[PDB]
């Protein structure tokens, strides 16, 4: 699993390993080792309650953009192992979950 | 609401078959899909196969049914069933909700649509090890 | 001699297709069939692929 995170007070704009290909769905979450977690942000424009506006919201219009993630607020769950579980048309169905990525913060 | 709590024996004898079931309360067969997570300390994040709420059966195509799920939706005891297991497939049994939604993008007759897949709630898992 | 081939699709695979009107093109059938009555001895007309 590749580590890529920043400093405190800078957005880890990490963006999703996979490529978008036909149109996209992707889903977001706070992952948690060993326990049940949770979901952050499941669609281009969804802002479930309880989420913040730190979030930044891309429509999936124009096809060509791509899926960045990048959250602020930062604490002791976001380390986790983030999975960008990302649904695409021609891809068909993704077995695995996504680009595993996790976020490193000391200081 | 949604509340889970395993049951699985912990320990199973090599090649031998397993019933790991969930319970679940405040809802039905037809609401929720039930799919389960693979996990373990240290390890990856995968479907091994899940079942469909009519008892239809959908496994990781590498897979291809190594294992046959049977539940029972009576005593909401939603069971995750292997058979002829391997220290290879030894994961956690989250009991995990499965929703869908479509995003449709053309001609619905044509066929031109998909499922962007939703995971709500997951399971707590019982954790099993070869002997 | 320059020959040019097809190249990938990029984006989402889609079918070609052609939308004909809802109630125009069978208001004009109608009318068509109606026609091809006089024209045939009054008969019923039937349309086949
Ligand atoms: C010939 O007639 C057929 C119908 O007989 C017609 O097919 C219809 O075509 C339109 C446009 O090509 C499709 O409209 C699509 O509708 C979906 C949802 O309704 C949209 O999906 C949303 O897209 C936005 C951004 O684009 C996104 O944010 C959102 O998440 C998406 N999902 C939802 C739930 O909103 C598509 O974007 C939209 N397509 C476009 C290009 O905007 C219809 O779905 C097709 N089918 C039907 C039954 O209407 C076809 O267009 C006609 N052809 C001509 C040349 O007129
Ligand atoms: C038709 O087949 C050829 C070869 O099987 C494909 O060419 C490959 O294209 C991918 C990326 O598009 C490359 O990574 C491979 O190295 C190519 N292979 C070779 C042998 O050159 C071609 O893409 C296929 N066409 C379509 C539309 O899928
Ligand atoms: C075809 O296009 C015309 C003009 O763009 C439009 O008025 C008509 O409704 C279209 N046909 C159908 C079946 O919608
Ligand atoms: C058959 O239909 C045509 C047109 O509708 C009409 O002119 C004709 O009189 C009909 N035949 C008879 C025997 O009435």
């Known amino acids: 699993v590749r580590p890529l995170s920043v400093a405190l007070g800078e957005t880890a704009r990490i963006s999703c390993g996979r490529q978008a290909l036909g149109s996209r769905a992707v889903q977001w979450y706070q992952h948690r080792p060993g326990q049940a977690p949770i979901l952050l942000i499941y669609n281009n424009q969804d802002r479930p309650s309880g989420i913040p506006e730190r979030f930044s919201g891309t429509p999936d219009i124009n096809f060509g953009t791509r899926a960045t993630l990048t959250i602020s607020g930062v604490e002791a769950g976001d380390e986790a192992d983030y999975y960008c579980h990302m649904w695409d048309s021609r891809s068909g169905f993704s077995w695995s979950f996504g680009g595993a990525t996790r976020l490193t913060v000391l200081g | 609401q949604v509340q889970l709590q395993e049951s699985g024996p912990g320990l199973v004898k090599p090649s031998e078959t397993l019933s790991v079931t969930c319970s679940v309360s405040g809802d039905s067969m037809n609401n929720y899909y039930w799919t389960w997570i693979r996990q373990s300390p240290g390890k990856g994040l995968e479907w091994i196969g899940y079942?469909?709420?009519?008892?239809?059966?959908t496994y990781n195509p590498s897979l291809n049914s190594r294992v046959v799920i049977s539940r029972d939706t009576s005593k909401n005891q939603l069971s995750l069933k292997l058979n002829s297991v391997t220290p290879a497939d030894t994961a956690v049994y989250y009991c995990?909700?499965?929703?869908?939604?479509?995003?449709?993008?053309?001609?619905?007759?044509?066929?031109?649509?998909?499922?962007?897949?939703?995971?709500?709630?997951w399971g707590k898992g019982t954790t099993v090890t070869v002997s | 001699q320059v020959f040019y081939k097809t190249g990938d699709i990029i984006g989402d695979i889609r079918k070609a297709y052609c939308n004909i009107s809802g109630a125009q093109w069978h208001k004009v059938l109608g009318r068509v069939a109606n026609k091809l009555k006089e024209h045939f001895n009054n008969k019923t007309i039937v349309f086949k692929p």
């Open positions: 995990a909700t499965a929703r869908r939604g479509q995003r449709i993008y053309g001609v619905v007759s044509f066929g031109e649509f998909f499922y962007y897949y939703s995971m709500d709630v």
């Open positions: 079942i469909s709420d009519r008892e239809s059966a």
